[PDB]
Design an enzyme around this catalytic site. Structure first.
Site, mmCIF file in Angstrom:
data_model
loop_
_atom_site.group_PDB
_atom_site.id
_atom_site.type_symbol
_atom_site.label_atom_id
_atom_site.label_comp_id
_atom_site.label_asym_id
_atom_site.label_seq_id
_atom_site.Cartn_x
_atom_site.Cartn_y
_atom_site.Cartn_z
ATOM 1 N N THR C 1 0.839 -1.233 0.000
ATOM 2 C CA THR C 1 0.000 0.000 0.000
ATOM 3 C C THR C 1 0.858 1.262 0.000
ATOM 4 O O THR C 1 0.473 2.265 -0.604
ATOM 5 C CB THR C 1 -0.941 0.041 1.213
ATOM 6 N N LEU C 2 2.015 1.189 0.675
ATOM 7 C CA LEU C 2 2.989 2.273 0.740
ATOM 8 C C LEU C 2 4.235 2.025 -0.096
ATOM 9 O O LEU C 2 4.867 2.994 -0.528
ATOM 10 C CB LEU C 2 3.415 2.509 2.198
ATOM 11 N N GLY C 3 4.608 0.770 -0.331
ATOM 12 C CA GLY C 3 5.720 0.460 -1.195
ATOM 13 C C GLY C 3 5.944 -1.040 -1.315
ATOM 14 O O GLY C 3 5.469 -1.809 -0.476
ATOM 15 N N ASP C 106 -4.191 4.841 -3.047
ATOM 16 C CA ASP C 106 -3.859 3.705 -2.203
ATOM 17 C C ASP C 106 -3.642 2.536 -3.156
ATOM 18 O O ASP C 106 -4.374 1.540 -3.100
ATOM 19 C CB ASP C 106 -4.971 3.424 -1.191
ATOM 20 N N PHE C 109 0.698 -2.397 -5.917
ATOM 21 C CA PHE C 109 1.995 -2.430 -6.597
ATOM 22 C C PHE C 109 2.170 -3.712 -7.414
ATOM 23 O O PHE C 109 3.087 -4.498 -7.189
ATOM 24 C CB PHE C 109 3.114 -2.296 -5.574
#
Lengths: 211, 240, 230, 208, 245, 227, 246, 233
Positions: C1-3, C106, C109
């Site tokens: 979600t962040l990386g 959001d 990836f």
């Protein structure tokens, strides 16, 4: 600030200094880091003193309400759970690391609370700027199943070692002894120019007698 | 739906039937008196006798103070009174918070009658069965006295009496009241109309309660008469 | 979600006669550690559809629960074989999900492939479906087949061959050089093995322990994993 | 942020006598003042006083919030309010905006009643901008000029003292502290409360 | 005397009449039977009331549904209330798999469904559900597990149950023999004979366009399967031949 | 759907509140006495079968260190009122850092009872609390009703035959009465009220001895007092 | 008019819905007895269906029927009343026990759980749109002092402690039975007293009900200090106990 | 109840709560309004107990805005509430348009609010009839009327309250266009006293101009009541 805790023969002894700083200066020379949660649970911590005061009052009164509702002796693990949820919900910005100690039905057990909501039961610990100086001599001299007098002497070894060493800690040394029945709080444990009348000038005066 | 009480709903005649029953509850309550005087404003009343073991000291159950410059007399149900007393105190301190000056009594009684009117109109909740004699001082209008009711109506009165035997008390006030009069004369007239309303020749000191509000020395203050002071006042009344 | 933290490498999907062929290396790399060398990176939604994966593993797992349970809801309101949802349906669903997560900021990836068969005139597997537990192949027209793609940004398209990751430079070049129409299974598997060999010899994040899955008239066939000949 | 509207407050104790004092400056852009009457002391009850030092808007807003809460408490209880209760309630209010707080460092000065006749015990305490209470039992100082006041009081404090000597002591301490701060000064006021009476006096300070 | 107007009101005898009226409605609605066997379970539904409707297609009206393709769920009562309860069962199964990555146990699912139905019998404003539901499954190790939730909100495990019209005579035929040892395939004869016997509205021609079937046995690899006509029509012909004789 | 079940009748009188007082009058009685140096709350519990233990059921409770309470009516109403009163004392102590005043607690619980009379979709509370406590301003004794109105007493009784118990307690009471004499008058008042025979586990007593914690007497101390 | 349909006070001060729910619990004609000794606490109930339109059929797995549930490993309960109401009540008890463990970090006490369920029952009584839960029950457990505990609650929300109690019909007549057997007991090993308490419970249910109590038709459970967990006893062991009583 | 319809159509097709509000209006005290040229006259009755009641506290006749004015007949509390609502809406219009609120907009808004409370659940109709006086945006005097049903219309002269039909019948046969201020005050005082006891203390009359509302003094009213008393006898 220097705080400590200790587990002894069927008892717990806490200890802390009596000085608070507002930067490189000292505001209060005889402060009281030790705080009353319950008749068999006490605490002391280091950080933002407003956070410590409010969180400790909240925990104290919540424990009192829980005791009144349940009519059972308060437990240290419950206080740990409330504190850990409280500090974890507020993202760790409430920097208030607390040394929790008490004597519940499961015997004496000391706890060490951290800002981010983690906790760990330990036989001894110390927190604050002068933590390391105190807790070095604690682990140098700590033994299992002491007498109470040995515990108090070691607590003055820790907190009096940190007072003499650390600049952010000083003043009197507090000790509180927690037991299954009764407790003791020794607040001063160890304890290691008139001008003439009319000197100042004025330009106004108004007396208002009080009813 | 089937269990609805029909509270906020007009009569065939346009009366709602609920404020009317509230007013009959008011008329059965203990009497309260109101008077405006050159020196002050007075809210004497009559205690209902529950038992002799009630604490005579303090226990002022009829007259209450909303602020240092506002105080009122209850003429109905005590719980509905006290919740509105708390709302009144909240409104007074809220106005002082907002504007940094004391609230005029007209503004305050407008707020209480507005919130009472709301439950009369909105929702299906019963109205408050209480009527006040709100009085106080302000620089805008000086000593004032009002008469609130469950309908949300208010009206100014130089002198009035409400509750049981309010007709006789209002007759005595119409006969005896004067435009310019002293505080002692107003207190004596309050004892007189309380005795007339209570069907007693001589009022009993334990059965009554008095209060007054004066802007003495540029600082308004309220006084609540004790048993000895009422005994002295009744002695003066018997002498007069 | 962040990386990305734990990353898969790449997948290749090609359509041929009798169905389609999709391949992937069984490995998920924790940066430059290669913690897991046996991971199932090709998933199944139903018969006649599969989901590819090259990216963060948590997002692929979340999309796997969503897609497979959408298939469960499809089965729970099914009365005929034609009521089964096609690969176009699922591909559009993943495209809308990626677009919505982009707009919310959001993202996932990942780089998804959805592919299978968008027709029911070739087999009678879906009339009586078998989720838990489980002839000659029937040739399938390329028009009845489908391969799709979904980007982080929701970008999507369809083509006879789709690859993700570093395979979009190596394997896509080999396919554009050599891909014909209606090649047999042996030629397709040779081409996939050559592309994955070139990837193994010039991609750290890839490997040789390959998974190969087929989607034919018989259905989804997870063959035995094999180490590449090299 | 406290350089903008710099200010200082002070309060001492003695033998049945208590003192509170403050500067009368209101600043703007640090190095230019706009008024010489802005009193940081606010009467709140017949024997409780509060000294608010910091941003002026936060000083005023906190004064009205506390006045609301106080006058509510005397009106409901129908009796005079205690210093400890006001101190705890003040600490709760300052904590209630723990994030985005009122930029004010207040103090509390007053008398403690011990009924039995009645004895007036002095009471003094100080706060951070969150409510970090700390009972002190002697001189209490708070503001940008706090360090100078801490330096002055220990040299000049004589334990319990007469109210006249207390006024001389607190006046000299405040005047010597304010002279050494550029953004704090412009007059002073000294309130010396006793059970019999309160004396309010203004000092011929270096107001220039 | 007014105590039967709202479900939230107890009678002077301590009894909720509003649920009894729902029970009487359910008993007069189309009947459903669901029993177990060696190979698996077969479960049926008899849509007798739609004999008057001649324009309905053959076997389109099917009251038997499923969740996860291994649990039969059906009903006897209002179609809409039933379908709402089916969708709630799908939702609870979905929540369980999203939480845990495992199919929901049936004994938990019936409990949640009973609480959902029970949760509507304690408000005046909410209408209680008019549907009696049967949930069942089968696996080779643990054998069949048939339950029945009711409007009251009571779940009990059964080895066989019938609800709706003619239920007393249907059960009177089901206790005629023990069906734990009878196979799933040859029990269709018995069920066809029983629906011909008990129900006084169906005949030879109604038997292949009103009545529904399904089983979850080893032949379907223990998964849901509506029965194909080539299995139904031999046993249907033999059953009507037996009844004619 | 929220509407006031409680409503004014012709002549008012709040018939539901009257029925709540009828519930209180039929419930087991309670009483309290205010003395020169203490306050008492006492109540009789019904003559129990041998299976009940008095160490589980308690009509006497404590809200704070110095404040007690006793009721006469529905027990669940008393339980929820007691819990919320504990919360009120706790929030006051959190704000102002002291034991709560008796008057403020009485006002808040009276307001809550009024809110339940006024609020739609509910019914009034069928009990009558009797709060006693000690604070800075001497001793207090108060009495909540279903109406949400509080009365300040020096000695009072609640429940069955409350008029006769009030008359008897008026006959035997003085303003300067000692605490032991107040306990004896409580025992005699409940003995006259019960019309039977008393012993330990049939009666329960709570008391606050001067500026000390509120104390609930055990059966041994009550047996000592009965002799 | 409508004085007793809802949870409202009638002219005499009697919420008649309370007794209607209580007699509805009695109409289920399922009896359940509890009893405690020293370091043990036994609970018993009947393995039957409640009284309603549906009757016990032949194709009904009678083992699945049970009036004894459990809230936690250390705490058990026996709910008697309507089936859905009993199931909802145990679910609410499971909720309060599990959030108590979450918030306070240690397992709940049965007294506190009984007070909490009594408070929810109070919330049902106070409001009109809440129908009463016709489900009384018992809760048992062992507290931090390692002693037994038994509590009961009604649809009135009246939680009270006990050392012997009965739910269902003939309770007033059944109080004499429990008092008689308890007085007989008053006139012991950690395991022998478990046996004494269990025979006392089964004998009490036999005397209250007055028929043989086939072991398949009943169900018994116990918490003690030997185990401390709520384990329900098997059928053959109950048959051995019944033969000892015979 | 909370959020349910209490006013509904009867079998005859009438909203009976609205007629009950009309009887509530009819029991309320009378009021009259006249206009001519560039001004208007507002009259309302008055009832006070002598020697006890304070006439200053009465607010039967009011001012809403710089120019708008209002008179009402019915329940005074509802009138006060709707008056505060209209004053709030006046200042809301003056902040979003930067022009003072014309009389037509305020009459429409009062009618809209009274229809809203008549057409929503959990609220009974406002038991008041108002009539608003003010200047239009083009500097034209127009007085509006408003009933509890949400009906509104512009009138040259009209009355409300007790015996409004008789006063309206009187005004039909005495109204003239472009009358003097004294003539309008005379006509209003005659019209209100057709159905009201003759005394100076039973009315509160005022005159509206572009400058401001000005209440007539007691001496002029005493002269006027004496003059019409002479005229009748």
């Amino acid at each position: 600030t220097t705080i400590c805790g200790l587990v002894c023969q069927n008892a717990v002894i806490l200890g802390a200094d009596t000085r608070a700083t507002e930067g490189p200066i000292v505001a209060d020379k005889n402060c009281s880091k030790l705080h009353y949660i319950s008749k068999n649970i006490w605490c002391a911590g280091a950080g933002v003193a407003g956070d410590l005061e409010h969180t400790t009052l909240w925990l104290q009164h919540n424990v009192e309400l829980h005791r009144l509702n349940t009519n059972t002796q308060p437990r240290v693990s419950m206080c740990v759970s409330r504190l850990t949820q409280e500090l974890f919900k507020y993202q760790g910005y409430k920097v208030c690391a607390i040394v929790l100690g008490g004597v519940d039905v499961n015997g004496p057990q000391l706890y060490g609370i951290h800002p981010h909501g983690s906790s760990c039961l330990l036989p001894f610990t110390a927190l604050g700027s002068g933590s390391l100086n105190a807790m070095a001599v604690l682990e140098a001299k700590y033994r299992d199943n002491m007498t109470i007098e040995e515990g108090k002497n070691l607590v003055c070894e820790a907190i009096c070692a940190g007072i003499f060493n650390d600049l952010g800690s000083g003043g009197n040394v507090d000790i509180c002894v927690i037991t299954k029945d009764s407790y003791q709080h020794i607040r001063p444990y160890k304890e290691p120019t008139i001008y003439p009348k009319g000197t100042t000038p004025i330009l106004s005066e108004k007396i208002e007698y009080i009813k | 739906r089937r269990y609805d009480s029909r509270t906020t709903t007009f009569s065939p005649e346009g009366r709602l039937y609920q404020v009317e029953y509230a007013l009959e509850a008011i008329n059965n309550a203990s009497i309260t008196i109101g008077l405006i005087t050159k020196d002050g404003v007075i809210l004497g009343a009559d205690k209902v006798f529950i038992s002799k073991l009630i604490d005579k000291a303090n226990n002022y159950e009829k007259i209450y103070k909303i602020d240092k410059h506002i105080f009122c007399g209850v003429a109905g149900l005590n719980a509905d009174a006290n919740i509105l007393i708390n709302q009144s105190r909240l409104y007074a301190q809220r106005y002082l918070y907002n504007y940094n000056e004391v609230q005029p009594v007209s503004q305050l009684v407008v707020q209480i009658c507005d919130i009472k009117q709301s439950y009369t109109q909105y929702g299906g909740l019963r109205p408050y069965g209480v009527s006040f004699l709100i009085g106080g001082y302000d620089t805008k209008d000086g000593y004032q006295l009002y008469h609130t009711d469950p309908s949300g109506n208010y009206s100014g009165w130089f002198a009035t009496a409400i509750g049981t035997n309010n007709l006789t008390a209002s007759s005595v006030l119409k006969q005896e009241w004067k435009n310019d009069m002293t505080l002692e004369e107003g207190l004596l007239l309050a004892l007189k109309t309380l005795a007339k309303s209570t069907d007693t020749e001589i009022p009993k000191s334990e059965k009554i309660e008095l209060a007054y509000l004066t802007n003495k020395d540029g600082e308004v203050y309220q006084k609540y008469l004790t048993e000895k002071e009422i005994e002295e006042l009744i002695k003066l009344y018997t002498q007069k | 979600t962040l990386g990305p933290v734990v990353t898969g490498t790449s997948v290749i999907a090609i359509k041929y006669k009798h169905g389609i062929m999709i391949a992937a290396d069984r490995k998920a790399s924790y940066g430059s550690y290669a913690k897991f060398q046996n991971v199932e990176r090709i998933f199944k939604i139903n018969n006649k559809t599969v989901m590819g994966f090259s990216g963060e593993l948590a997002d692929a797992q979340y999309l796997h629960e969503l897609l497979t349970r959408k298939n469960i809801n499809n089965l729970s309101e099914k009365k005929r074989k034609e009521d089964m949802y096609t690969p176009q349906h699922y591909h559009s669903y993943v495209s809308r999900v990626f677009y919505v997560r982009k707009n919310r900021i959001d993202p996932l990836f990942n780089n998804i492939i959805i592919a299978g068969i968008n027709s029911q005139k070739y087999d009678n597997n879906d009339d009586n479906v078998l989720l838990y537990t489980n002839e000659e192949y029937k040739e399938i027209h390329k028009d009845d087949l489908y391969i799709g793609f979904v980007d982080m940004h929701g970008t999507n398209f369809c083509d006879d061959y789709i690859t993700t990751g570093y395979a979009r430079y190596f394997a896509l070049t080999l396919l554009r050089d050599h891909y014909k129409d209606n090649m047999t299974e042996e030629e397709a598997r040779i081409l996939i093995n050559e592309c994955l060999r070139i990837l193994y010899f010039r991609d750290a994040t890839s490997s040789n322990f390959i998974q190969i899955v087929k989607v034919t008239s018989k259905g989804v066939e997870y063959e035995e994993p094999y180490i590449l000949p090299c | 942020i406290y350089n903008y509207n710099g200010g200082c407050v002070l309060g001492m104790s003695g033998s049945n006598c208590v003192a509170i004092a403050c500067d009368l400056r209101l600043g703007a852009n640090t190095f230019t003042t706009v008024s010489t009457k802005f009193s940081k002391i606010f009467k709140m009850n017949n024997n409780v006083y509060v000294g608010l030092s910091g941003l002026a808007t936060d000083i005023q807003t906190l004064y009205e919030i506390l006045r609301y809460r106080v006058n509510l408490y005397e009106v409901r209880q129908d009796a005079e309010m205690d210093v400890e209760c006001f101190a705890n309630m003040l600490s709760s209010i300052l904590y209630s905006n723990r994030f985005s707080p009122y930029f004010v460092n207040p103090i509390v000065v007053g008398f403690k009643l011990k009924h039995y006749k009645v004895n007036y015990e002095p009471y003094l305490t100080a706060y951070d901008l969150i409510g970090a209470k700390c009972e002190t039992r002697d001189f209490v100082v708070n503001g940008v000029t706090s360090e100078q006041l801490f330096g002055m009081c220990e040299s000049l404090y004589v334990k319990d003292q007469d109210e006249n000597g207390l006024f001389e002591t607190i006046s000299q301490c405040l005047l010597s502290a304010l002279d050494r701060d550029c953004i704090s000064g412009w007059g002073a006021e000294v309130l010396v409360l006793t059970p019999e009476k309160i004396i309010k006096k203004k000092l011929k300070a270096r107001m220039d | 005397a007014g105590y039967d107007l709202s479900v939230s009101t107890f009678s002077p005898d301590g009894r909720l009449y509003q649920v009894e009226y729902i029970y009487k409605s359910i008993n007069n609605n189309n009947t459903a039977l669901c029993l177990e066997c060696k190979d698996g379970i077969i479960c049926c539904c008899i849509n007798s009331n739609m004999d008057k409707n001649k324009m309905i297609k053959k076997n389109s009206y099917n009251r038997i549904y499923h969740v996860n393709n291994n649990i039969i769920i059906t009903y006897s009562g209002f179609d809409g209330d039933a379908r709402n309860i089916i969708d709630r069962a799908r939702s609870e199964a979905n929540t369980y798999y999203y939480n845990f990555h495992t199919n929901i146990p049936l004994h938990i699912l019936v409990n949640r469904i009973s609480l959902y139905i029970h949760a509507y019998t304690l408000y005046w404003h909410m209408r209680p559900f008019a549907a009696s539901i049967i949930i069942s499954s089968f696996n080779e190790k643990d054998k069949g597990d048939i339950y029945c939730i009711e409007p009251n909100g009571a779940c009990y495990k059964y080895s066989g149950i019938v609800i709706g019209k003619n239920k007393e005579m249907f059960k009177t035929e089901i206790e005629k023999k023990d069906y734990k040892d009878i196979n799933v395939r040859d029990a269709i004869e018995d069920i066809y004979k029983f629906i011909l016997t008990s129900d006084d509205h169906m005949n030879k021609n109604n038997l292949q366009n009103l009545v529904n079937f399904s089983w979850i046995c080893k032949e379907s690899s223990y998964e849901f399967q509506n029965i194909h006509e080539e299995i139904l029509t031999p046993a249907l012909n033999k059953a009507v031949e037996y009844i004619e004789k | 759907y929220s509407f006031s079940l409680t409503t004014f009748s012709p002549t008012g009188k709040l018939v539901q509140i009257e029925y709540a007082l009828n519930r209180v009058s039929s419930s087991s009685p309670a009483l309290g006495i205010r003395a020169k140096n203490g306050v008492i709350i006492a109540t009789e519990k019904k003559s129990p079968n041998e299976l009940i233990e008095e160490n589980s059921i308690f009509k006497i409770q404590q809200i704070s260190e110095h404040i007690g309470i006793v009721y006469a009516g529905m027990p669940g109403d008393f339980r929820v009122l007691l819990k919320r009163a504990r919360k009120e004392a706790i929030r006051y102590s959190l704000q102002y850092g002291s034991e709560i005043l008796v008057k403020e607690l009485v006002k808040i619980i009276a307001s809550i009872v009024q809110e339940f009379t006024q609020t739609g979709g509910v019914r009034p509370f069928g009990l009558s609390l009797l709060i006693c406590g000690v604070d800075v301003y001497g001793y207090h004794l108060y009495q909540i009703d279903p109406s949400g109105c509080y009365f300040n007493w020096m000695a009072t009784c609640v429940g069955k035959d409350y008029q006769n118990n009030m008359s008897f307690l008026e006959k035997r009471y003085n303003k300067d009465i000692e605490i032991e004499d107040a306990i004896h008058t409580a025992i005699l008042t409940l003995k006259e009220s019960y019309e039977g025979v008393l012993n330990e586990k049939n009666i329960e007593i709570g008391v606050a001895y001067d500026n000390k914690p509120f104390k609930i007497l055990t059966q041994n101390e009550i047996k000592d007092y009965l002799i | 008019m409508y004085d007793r349909h809802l949870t409202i006070f009638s002219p005499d001060g009697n919420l008649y819905q309370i007794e209607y729910a209580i007699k509805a619990v009695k109409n289920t004609n399922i009896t359940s007895v509890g009893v405690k000794g020293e370091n043990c606490a036994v609970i018993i109930s009947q393995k039957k269906m409640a009284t309603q339109y549906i009757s016990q059929d032949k194709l009904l797995d009678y083992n699945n029927i049970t009036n004894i549930y459990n809230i936690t490993d250390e705490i058990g309960c026996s709910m008697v009343g309507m089936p859905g109401d009993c199931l909802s009540m145990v679910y609410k008890a499971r909720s309060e026990a599990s959030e108590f463990l979450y918030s306070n970090g240690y397992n709940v006490n049965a007294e506190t759980l009984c007070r909490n369920i009594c408070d929810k029952i109070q919330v049902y009584t106070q409001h009109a749109y809440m129908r009463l839960h016709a489900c009384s029950g018992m809760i048992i457990g062992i507290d931090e002092n390692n002693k037994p505990e038994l509590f009961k609650f009604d649809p009135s929300g009246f939680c009270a402690g006990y050392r012997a109690c009965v739910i269902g019909n003939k309770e007033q007549e059944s109080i004499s039975v429990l008092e008689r057997l308890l007085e007989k007991r008053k006139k012991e090993t950690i395991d022998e007293d478990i046996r004494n308490t269990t025979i006392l419970a089964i004998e009490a249910l036999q005397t209250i009900l007055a028929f043989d109590l086939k072991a398949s038709e009943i169900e018994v459970a116990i918490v003690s200090t030997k185990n401390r967990n709520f384990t329900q006893i098997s059928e053959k062991e109950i048959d051995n106990y019944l033969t000892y009583i015979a | 109840s909370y959020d349910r319809a209490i006013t509904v159509f009867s079998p005859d097709g009438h909203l009976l709560q609205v007629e009950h509000a009309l009887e509530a209006v009819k029991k309320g005290g009378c009021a009259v309004a006249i206009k001519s040229s560039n001004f208007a006259v507002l009259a309302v009755e008055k009832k006070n107990i002598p020697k006890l009641q304070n006439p200053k506290t009465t607010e039967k006749l009011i001012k809403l805005d710089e120019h708008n004015c209002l008179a009402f007949a019915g329940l005074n509390a509802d009138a006060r509430v709707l008056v505060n609502k209209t004053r709030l809406e006046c200042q809301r219009y003056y902040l979003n348009m930067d022009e003072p609120a014309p009389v037509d907009y305020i009459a429409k808004y009062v009618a809209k609010v009274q229809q809203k409370f008549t057409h929503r659940g959990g609220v009974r109709p406002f038991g008041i009839a108002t009539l608003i006086a003010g200047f239009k945006n083009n500097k034209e005097i127009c007085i509006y009327q408003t009933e509890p049903s949400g009906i509104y219309a512009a009138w040259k002269a009209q009355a409300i309250g007790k015996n409004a039909k008789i006063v309206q019948e009187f005004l039909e046969k005495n109204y003239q266009e472009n009358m003097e201020q004294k003539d309008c005050i005379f006509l209003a005082l005659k019209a209100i006293f057709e159905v009201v006891e003759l005394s100076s203390k039973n009315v509160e009359v005022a005159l509206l101009t572009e400058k401001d509302l000005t209440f007539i003094e007691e001496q002029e009213i005493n002269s006027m009541v004496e003059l019409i008393d002479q005229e009748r006898t």
